């Protein structure tokens, strides 16, 4: 015979062979290799995700949900935004820059977890039909240790990334609030509920200027100081 | 008509997904993605990897030359699939 070295292995399965295309093969059948973790089988061939004991591991790709201090369910154009009341009526809008920054950060986090899978071709046997003794016990022990360590790693990673994602999504809102407060130097007062009381006549043009980052506070200062004090 | 009000806020969704953090074990967020795959197609895809199916034929039986293993001569593979119906129909043997 001829003895080579390569990427060949063996597997026990009772599943039919199809005409599809997939890079991960499992005794239960082929599985997609986009997610980093799997709960199908410990026997894999190809670029397969790591086996973990858990069945559900959710990663947060959004901000906290506060239904009816509260969220706006009708704002379908962005993540963070403004709602204003003035002499010409009431209105609402969304801020594109902050929304895009948060989306970009979340997408960058996701791109480092989805699609990065290692290739393992030939490994040890993980299912036994007879009882032998010391070597089989050692193999079982090694596999159990590996599975437990990887499950712990998966849980800790999910918790860490969720914590930092929620922190950044809150930080974006705090940044927008502080920027708006700094823009209105002495012509507006904080009310403590996320709202600013602006002590001068504001049209749609002035609110658009505030949302536009082109708001000159010097023109509206004498009237605001007269009304505030 | 001498004062305006400007409020800042975020967006909510009707339904929501519960996730876990280091500090909070139950926090509801707008959107979340699963990181564990728990489903299979039920068939072994054969396009990228060369797959050799052994029915009624174990690998050692194919190597030795079983009467039912005559179709596996001079064959290559990337994954040999052994079935649970595999049996031997030649002289009894015992690999130490």
């Amino acid at each position: 015979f001829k003895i080579r070295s390569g990427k060949s292995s063996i597997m026990r399965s009772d599943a039919p062979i199809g005409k599809c295309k997939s890079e991960c093969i499992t005794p239960n059948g082929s599985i997609p290799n986009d997610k980093p973790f799997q709960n199908v089988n410990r026997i894999t061939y190809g670029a397969c995700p790591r086996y973990v004991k858990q069945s559900t591991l959710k990663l947060a790709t959004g901000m906290r949900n506060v239904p009816e201090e509260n969220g706006w369910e009708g704002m379908v154009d962005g993540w963070y935004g403004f709602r204003w009341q003035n002499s010409e009526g009431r209105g609402q809008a969304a801020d594109l820059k902050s929304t895009q920054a948060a989306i970009d950060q979340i997408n960058g986090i996701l791109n480092r977890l989805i699609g990065k899978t290692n290739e393992k071709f030939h490994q040890i046997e993980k299912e036994f039909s007879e009882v032998e003794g010391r070597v089989q016990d050692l193999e079982k022990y090694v596999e159990d240790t590996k599975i437990d360590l990887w499950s712990y790693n998966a849980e800790l990673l999910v918790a860490l990334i969720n914590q930092h994602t929620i922190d950044l999504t809150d930080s974006e809102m705090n940044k927008l609030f502080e920027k708006t407060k700094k823009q209105l130097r002495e012509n507006a007062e904080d009310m403590g509920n996320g709202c600013f009381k602006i002590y001068h006549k504001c049209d749609n043009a002035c609110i658009g200027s505030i949302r536009n980052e082109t708001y000159d506070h010097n023109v509206y200062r004498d009237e605001a100081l007269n009304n505030r004090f | 008509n001498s004062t305006a009000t400007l409020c800042l806020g975020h967006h909510a969704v009707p339904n929501g997904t519960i996730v876990k953090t280091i500090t909070n074990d139950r926090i509801e967020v707008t959107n979340a993605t699963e990181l564990v795959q728990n489903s299979s197609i039920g068939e072994i895809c054969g396009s990228p990897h060369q797959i050799l199916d052994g029915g009624n034929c174990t690998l050692i039986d194919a190597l030795l030359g079983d009467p039912q293993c005559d179709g596996f001569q001079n064959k290559e593979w990337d994954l040999f699939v052994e079935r649970s119906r595999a049996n031997s129909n030649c002289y009894p043997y015992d690999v130490p």
Partner: antibody
Framework: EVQLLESGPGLVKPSETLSLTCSLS??????????LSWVRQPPGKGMEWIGY???????KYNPSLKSRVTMSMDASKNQFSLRLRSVTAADTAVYYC??????????????????WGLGTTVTVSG | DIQLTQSPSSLSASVGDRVTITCRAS??????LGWYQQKPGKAPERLIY???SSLPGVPSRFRGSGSGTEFTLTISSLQPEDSATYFC?????????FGPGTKV
């Protein structure tokens, strides 16, 4: 998202009560900003508001339908139903169930009829 | 009740021209006006909610502008896909009066 689906009799004999139900998928009926409303359109005429119901046990109907209208809401099933008591030939119409969004805060802001449902035809005849 | 009236009806136009629909209210409202589109045999779809605020997915041809007791919906270009009924909604008060549709 939030979708609504309508179900009920397509034909009602005169001088009888007409009953319809609207079921909600993708959200909860017990939210403070949901005002579930019923609208109707006779063929060839304008569209008419019937009334709305809210999870706080508050209802509000159109004065034109003075007393022969009632609205109920079941939270355990995520449904809300409409009943019309006395029926004439002027009630032949396409009925829609819609969801209104009136949000609160320091600056209350309404959005109108956001989510609509596929209308059901109700024909009144003997 | 705040009655709503629509000035144009059964309007016919070319493919690539400009059209306008006007909604007037008997009583004074303040920016509370929505513009809806209804194709024959289908449910209405919301186009404008704050009367100067287009929703995601609405093509750029549609625009809305107005206040008080006068509101307008303007389309700069008319594609063959946009041939349906259009109506206006008021939500300042609860009776929720509509307006008779305008056919394009």
């Amino acid at each position: 998202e939030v979708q609504l689906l309508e179900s009920g009799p397509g034909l009602v004999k005169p001088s009888e009560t007409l009953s319809l139900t609207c079921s909600l998928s993708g959200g909860f009926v017990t939210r403070n900003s949901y005002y579930l409303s019923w609208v109707r359109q006779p063929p060839g005429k304008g569209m008419e508001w019937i009334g709305y119901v809210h999870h706080s046990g508050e209802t509000k109907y159109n004065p034109s339908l003075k007393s022969r209208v009632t609205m109920s809401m079941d939270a355990s099933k995520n449904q809300f139903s409409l009943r019309l008591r006395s029926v004439t030939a002027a009630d032949t119409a396409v009925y829609y169930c819609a969801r209104d969004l009136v949000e609160g805060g320091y600056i209350p802001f309404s959005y109108g009829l956001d989510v609509w449902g596929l209308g059901t035809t109700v024909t009144v005849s003997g | 009740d705040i009655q709503l009236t629509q000035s144009p009806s059964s309007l016919s136009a070319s493919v690539g021209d400009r059209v306008t629909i006007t909604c007037r209210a008997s009583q004074g409202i303040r920016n509370d006006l929505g513009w809806y589109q209804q194709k024959p045999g289908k449910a209405p779809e919301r186009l404008i909610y704050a009367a100067s605020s287009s929703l995601p997915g609405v093509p750029s041809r549609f625009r809305g502008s107005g206040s008080g007791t006068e509101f307008t919906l303007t389309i700069s270009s008319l594609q063959p896909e946009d041939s349906a009924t259009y109506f206006c909604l008021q939500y300042h008060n609860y009776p929720r009066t509509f307006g008779p549709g305008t056919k394009v």
